[PDB]
Amino acid sequence: LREQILLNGARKARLTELVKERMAYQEYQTILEDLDAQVNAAYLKRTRT
């Protein structure tokens, strides 16, 4: 048991290094998409009219 806990902690320790960087990408994407909708939705009106 003491042999396995350390391995699990090491594995979970590494994942926390990869999760944090992926969270930042989410915030950058969630604002980029909003701009994409406006620029995309701000041209359809030209076709409509």
Next chain:
Amino acid sequence: EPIIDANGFPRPDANKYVPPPVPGVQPMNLTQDNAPDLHLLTPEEIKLCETLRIQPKPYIMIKEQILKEAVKGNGSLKKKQAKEICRLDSQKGGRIFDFMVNAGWVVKA
């Protein structure tokens, strides 16, 4: 086997002297409920106890007295000397003595 070895690197795949059967001797099975101190006898000696029909605790006492008698006299004793000390049938005393000398805890004079 350890999952991670001594140097701290996790393993890659993480996830004998046989005494002859003395004539007219019927071995008896030794059970944890019957033998109190079974968990101490060595594997090379447990076979002898079954083959000889003797319980562990009596066996240890016989081992002690033979050891005491030998050490007092430089460790050498005569065959009749071992026979009398055991105080049982001749074959039983002969077999246990032959086991001790082979093991090396005593020497035959």
